[PDB]
Amino acid sequence: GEVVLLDFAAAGGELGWLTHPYGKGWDLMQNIMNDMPIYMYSVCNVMSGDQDNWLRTNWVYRGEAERIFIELKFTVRDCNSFPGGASSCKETFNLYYAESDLDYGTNFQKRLFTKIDTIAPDEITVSSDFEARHVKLNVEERSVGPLTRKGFYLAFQDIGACVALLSVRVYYKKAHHHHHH
């Protein structure tokens, strides 16, 4: 009994989310070491001064949803992995949203967005695990509401972490929420 409004991983790299600023920050990446390609939005501008990198979903039609659940899956590399140059590395990133009746398209104004939470990993990925291709996937969920406008955006702010965002699943929940088969 979940109704899914957005599912990044299911979309196979095709959603073309907005990134700000032009060039520097979040980047759509692919990994093809498994049977099927994996997509993600990654950023890893550690050792590069202050970072303020934004990734914005497309507009999401709310429909009947009043309270949404936002499920994220992501990796974070240990700041000890990088030369002495966390004096220039963080292990969190920030989740934001904004409601609006109309889609503003390519006009992204971060001042319209409210922070939902700081997102922190239960497990950081250390270099030996990274080099062995055993990354530590984290799952975090947050809920937002009550929603009142025709739609909304989510956005992700990186402040200088080494993070890969592999899944963004937004749903609302009806009674009898279970699986089967």
Binding site: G16, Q30, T75
Partner: peptide
């Protein structure tokens, strides 16, 4: 530089 995820490369649908 460093990558966030092993064996990842920039991707854009064509």
């Amino acid at each position: 530089x460093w990558l966030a995820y092993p064996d990842s490369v920039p991707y854009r649908p064509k």
